[PDB]
Write a protein that binds this ligand. Structure first.
Ligand SMILES: *C1O[C@H](CO)[C@@H](O[C@@H]2O[C@H](CO)[C@@H](O)[C@H](O)[C@H]2NC(C)=O)[C@H](O)[C@H]1NC(C)=O
Ligand SMILES: *[C@H]1O[C@H](CO)[C@@H](O[C@@H]2O[C@H](CO)[C@@H](O)[C@H](O)[C@H]2NC(C)=O)[C@H](O)[C@H]1NC(C)=O
Lengths: 532, 534
């Protein structure tokens, strides 16, 4: 329909028109951007998609990347929401574009979405990552893409030409390169690209921030509940290989190329099956194959890379949800389920801590306990739970995010920080888990608007507000209104440290993004780990 | 008057009659209870006063043991109330007895007061420690004794027989023994006998709980504002001798030991006293050179170890802190602090202040202390740092200790009752920022507002009276509250888990729970682990 055929540096594309309670949108799903990473090319960097005869179908989401699937609570809304919803293939390197109707005439800004769940899982096709509502309500090109997760994206033997590591990141970067070359063709501005992502997505955005060759392919960044300086988010050559060889053995086999080709042969689902076995102690919020500090894609540990980086006039929007910790608990922490009240007892809390905060000496542990216990009521299992929720939340998400925000501001980036504190009326998860890790996305992607779904109609008015903030950011590097009418959203900075709450009430401006606790995690705890 | 003549196991005593707005009391001031600890006796245990002929004039306060005299704000009211009001002498082992004007014919109960003062100062004769008001108004017998402080009471060259250590404690003990054998002849019941003291006086009392021979000599305990497990209140044999020697050195001089000691028994007392402060390990606030020693003798083992592993069934004890322990101490040596300004310190003076506050501890332990005490939204804010430093000093040295003991005592059979005295006396001459500072509960407990000449608000006198009641009650029964009265504000038992304490001020009793709980977890549970793995 002219609108739905397009030409990209590699061939023609037949798009598919799409349906919105307010407008329509052109969408192009499953654009191949890489030669399938297979057989001998598994564990290797991507190669750019070879050009192609005739017209490529782009009507339909392509296959999801080979990945563990969450057999924990079979068929629960909230669990299943994140599981794959297409064939699993190792042939999974496709991306999707959403552009408005009609294709607009002058170069418009592009939002590129990197998806979540610990580098072990995720796909660009899940329902919650639907372009339409956002592209329509705010006219911005939107791209999401698929990158290799778990060992197929992240397994590394640092040193080898064989599996050099971080290839899932390389995959993301190739998507960004394809975005330079091609977004022109859909009305997008190669020179106004905002990255955004969540959990490992947010950590990915940040790694792109720290990695020069990525640095020319976007201009602004949104980091949603993740930071590349989190304890879970990387892993250095040492452990990286120790965990790669330990998979090879754990799967029968086998001296460097040997180990790999000899592993390029095991079927997919077997690698998937042994993934969590390499993790080297019992632990919530830790994943086995994550980015590695090899000296190549990451030049050095993301703290050091972030202390001394190039940030001036970078604008970044970063945030966390009210209860980051809870979601994770029901996966290894003694005495947790969605079903019961999860009211725990001291000695469970205590073993909880050693699992929230894995492989840290016992002085370190008693340190945590001391901070997180309410010595007035060391017993009360309400507290003790909200407690272990905080411990996991802070250590892994909040504190790493606050650190980055601080360190970025002070090297002159305009940083806007949010705290999202609304529990979706729709929400499959116990009233106890509060607002959990992930439940901001729904509203950022404008899902309430699809009335085929139960959202209050005050929620639909929020959803619009958020999309505005996001798109405003994308457009101008400021999320707010381009009118001193509302209350202002002030920049985060190292001293004042101002964030805003995102809920139904209007923007309240608070100071101190979990300041006392971060003092402990960011400043003291490291001193204590390298003293003892 | 023949109400005033009395015969004690040693001989005869003339007393004196003292006025009270509400009555009169018979006072026996400066009864000798030991042979002068002079010459060859300096440093030695005390020997029971031997009988005398004639009548000892017990009509006025005897001498103050020799001690250093604070001259930081000279002639300042809040400073001089604690300095000696009598001449210093090494001949100072006297006690006093106050008893009710119709000398009770009932065997009435006994309150024994032990003055505080870092183990380095203080006298039973100070104005603030007047028995008359609490006696006339509660019909008890009140005993305050003098005991050797500083090097004279506490210098030890542990192991040798010439400076055995802890003789101030011994002085106290023998005064207790004198109350057994004699209180009887004044009113007092040699059973129902309650020990009470403040700061080092309190921790003194503490040590008497932990020392079997003393244990026979009193029934119930009060610890105001100090505990024997506090960091300042005892020193190990190592330092003891390190410090005795270091003294002997600066004072010129020298088996050996014997040789050191007797070359120190030769120096004028004043000379010993002038070199006292010079013997301390490093710069510090709330640390004192000569304190009791864990010799293995009087203190079987570190008073904490003893406190832990010990049965306390059958013991009732009343403990408490004031609202701002820390403040008073800062004006003696924290960077940036004065009575005379607003002591609005800088962050840099704060970090500085922590090292003098928590002396001799690794930088990592210090940095832990900094972490816990800093507000990280306002790391820079002066008032907040001023408060914070005042909490660091106060927590670590007083409250945390008191709390630890009180926890352990109740969980091991004691029946324990905590308070937090939070009333700022209308007459206080300390600056407002200091709050209710260390030691400023005493006037009240002793009932000094009731003296005509001290200009105290008349609502304060009620407070005073009120307090003497919880104290006398605790003295009598092992329980502070009127027993015949479900009707009135309960003071509950403090308790390892429930942790309850009253507040004492002008309002009727409140019940709060947790005695700086979160801090005390740092000081008592966490820091020791940190300290001993680094
Ligand atoms: C009153 O406080 C002031 C600050 O407001 C104090 O100033 C410093 O204190 C030290 C003693 O701790 C003195 O040696 C210095 O003269 C001061 N140094 C600086 C950095 O200014 C002061 O000591 C206090 N008392 C007075 C009036 O002497
Ligand atoms: C919901 O909570 C209970 C406690 O209320 C959980 O308790 C235990 O879970 C462990 C694994 O962590 C099992 O080995 C135990 O046998 C459980 N014991 C108890 C006290 O029930 C429980 O796991 C949770 N889920 C359900 C309903 O199975």
């Amino acid at each position: 329909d002219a609108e739905l055929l397009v030409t990209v540096r590699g061939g023609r594309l037949r798009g598919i028109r799409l349906k919105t309670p307010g407008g329509p949108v052109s969408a192009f799903l499953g654009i191949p951007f890489a030669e399938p990473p297979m057989g001998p090319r598994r564990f290797l960097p991507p190669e750019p998609k070879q050009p192609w005869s005739g017209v490529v179908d782009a009507t339909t989401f392509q296959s999801v990347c080979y990945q563990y699937v969450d057999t924990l609570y079979p068929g629960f809304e909230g669990t299943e929401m994140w599981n794959p919803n297409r064939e699993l293939s190792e042939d999974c390197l496709y991306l999707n574009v959403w552009t408005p109707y009609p294709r607009p005439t002058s170069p418009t800004p592009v939002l590129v979405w990197i998806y979540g769940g610990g580098f072990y899982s995720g796909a660009s096709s899940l329902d919650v990552y639907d372009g339409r509502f956002l592209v329509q309500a705010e006219r911005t090109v939107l791209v999401s893409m698929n990158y290799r997760v778990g060992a197929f994206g992240f397994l590394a033997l640092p040193g080898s030409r064989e599996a050099p590591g971080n290839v899932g990141l390389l995959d993301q970067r190739l998507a960004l390169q394809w975005v330079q070359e091609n977004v022109a063709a859909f009305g997008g501005d190669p020179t106004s690209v905002t990255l955004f992502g969540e959990s490992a997505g947010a950590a990915s955005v940040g790694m792109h921030l720290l990695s020069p060759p990525s640095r020319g392919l976007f201009h602004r960044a949104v980091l949603q509940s993740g930071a590349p300086n989190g304890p879970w988010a990387t892993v250095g050559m040492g452990e990286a290989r120790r965990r790669a060889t330990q998979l090879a053995h754990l799967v029968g086999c086998p001296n460097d190329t040997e180990l790999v080709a000899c592993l390029r042969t095991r079927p997919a689902q077997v690698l998937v099956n042994h993934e969590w076995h390499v993790l080297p102690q019992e632990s919530v919020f830790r994943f086995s194959f994550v980015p590695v500090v090899d000296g190549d894609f990451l030049s050095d540990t993301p703290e050091a890379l972030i202390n001394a980086g190039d940030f001036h006039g970078l604008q970044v929007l970063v945030g966390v949800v009210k209860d980051e910790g809870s979601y994770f608990l029901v996966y290894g922490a003694p005495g947790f389920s969605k079903d019961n009240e999860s009211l725990i007892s001291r000695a469970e809390f205590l073993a909880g801590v050693r699992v929230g905060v894995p492989q840290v000496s016992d002085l370190a542990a008693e340190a945590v306990v001391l901070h997180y216990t309410d010595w007035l009521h060391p017993e009360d299992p309400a507290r003790l739970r909200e407690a272990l929720s905080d411990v996991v939340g802070d250590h892994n998400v909040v504190c790493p995010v606050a650190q980055l925000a601080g360190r970025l501001a002070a090297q002159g980036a305009r940083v806007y920080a949010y705290v999202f504190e609304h529990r979706a009326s729709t929400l499959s998860w116990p009233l106890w888990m509060g607002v959990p890790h992930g439940y901001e996305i729904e509203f950022i992607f404008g899902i309430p608007l699809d009335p085929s779904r139960n959202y209050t109609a005050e929620e639909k008015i929020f959803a619009q507000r958020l999309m505005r903030y996001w798109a405003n950011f994308a457009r101008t590097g400021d999320p707010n209104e381009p009118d001193p009418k509302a209350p202002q959203w002030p920049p985060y900075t190292a001293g004042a440290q101002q964030y805003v709450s995102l809920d139904l009430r209007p923007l309240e401006v608070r100071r101190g993004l979990r300041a006392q606790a971060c003092a402990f995690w960011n400043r003291f705890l490291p001193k204590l780990l390298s003293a003892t």
